[PDB]
Amino acid sequence: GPHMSIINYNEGQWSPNNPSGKKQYDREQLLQLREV
Amino acid sequence: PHMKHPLMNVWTLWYLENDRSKSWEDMQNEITSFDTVEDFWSLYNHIKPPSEIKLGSDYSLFKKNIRPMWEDAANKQGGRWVITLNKSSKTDLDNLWLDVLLCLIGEAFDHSDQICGAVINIRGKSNKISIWTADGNNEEAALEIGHKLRDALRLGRNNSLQYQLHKDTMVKQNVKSIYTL
Numbered sequence: 001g002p003h004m005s006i007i008n009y010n011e012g013q014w015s016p017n018n019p020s021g022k023k024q025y026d027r028e029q030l031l032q033l034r035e036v
Numbered sequence: 037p038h039m040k041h042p043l044m045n046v047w048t049l050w051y052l053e054n055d056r057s058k059s060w061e062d063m064q065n066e067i068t069s070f071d072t073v074e075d076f077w078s079l080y081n082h083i084k085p086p087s088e089i090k091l092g093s094d095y096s097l098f099k100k101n102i103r104p105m106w107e108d109a110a111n112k113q114g115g116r117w118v119i120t121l122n123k124s125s126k127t128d129l130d131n132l133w134l135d136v137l138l139c140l141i142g143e144a145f146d147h148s149d150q151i152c153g154a155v156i157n158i159r160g161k162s163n164k165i166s167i168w169t170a171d172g173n174n175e176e177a178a179l180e181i182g183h184k185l186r187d188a189l190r191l192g193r194n195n196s197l198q199y200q201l202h203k204d205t206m207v208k209q210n211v212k213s214i215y216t217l
């Protein structure tokens with residue numbers, strides 16, 4: 001399944017390396033995180 | 037070690053089970069609240085999809101502290117984008133509801149601050165999915181959410197959008213539509 005290290009984050013989006021980014025997630029992004 | 041992805045809002049899942057021995061409010065059951073993508077999935081993954089819950093039941097996902105009812109102050113001056121479904125399959129039903137939930141928790145709307153929650157009604161004749169917004173008089177926000185809904189959701193020649201003010205549907209227990217997309 002999808003690997004946390006390869007999750008793509010848009011510019012300005014929240015990420016574990018960008019706590020200030022917007023907490024907005026696309027549909028495909030949310031489905032991507034459905035697997036631990 | 038695993039860092040969860042926080043959502044812009046805290047959301048609460050409600051499940052209504054028809055029970056005439058109780059008032060409608062008391063039919064609402066607060067399940068759990070979540071504020072991360074992972075915790076949403078931990079909830080959704082292990083609850084029945086809409087196609088499997090009892091007839092007469094609802095699922096409602098609303099921002100924390102907003103009850104899924106007209107009386108709540110966040111919904112008094114609001115309305116809902118109603119999506120009457122034309123007897124689609126179970127997967128189409130469930131995928132539509134999930135996509136709605138992902139629109140909500142993912143903050144897909146420009147006027148996401150106007151979003152209060154969403155309700156799916158599982159009924160015998162036809163099922164119904166509604167997105168509740170805060171201010172029905174806010175035409176700019178109602179249309180943006182409406183346009184964004186038919187865009188993020190698969191355009192359906194068969195199913196249309198109907199925006200109904202809560203002030204109206206509350207009186208008529210038959211109900212006028214103030215927008216149509």
Ligand SMILES: C[n+]1cn([C@@H]2O[C@H](COP(=O)(O)OP(=O)(O)OP(=O)(O)O)[C@@H](O)[C@H]2O)c2nc(N)[nH]c(=O)c21
Pocket residue numbers: 060061094104105106107157159164209
């Ligand atoms: C959303 N809602 C529904 N009800 C009750 O539930 C009824 C509507 O029920 P419903 O909106 O849950 O679905 P239904 O498909 O049966 O609606 P219908 O097509 O009009 O038949 C109302 O007549 C009320 O008795 C509500 N009653 C209160 N007090 N507050 C609410 O916000 C509310």
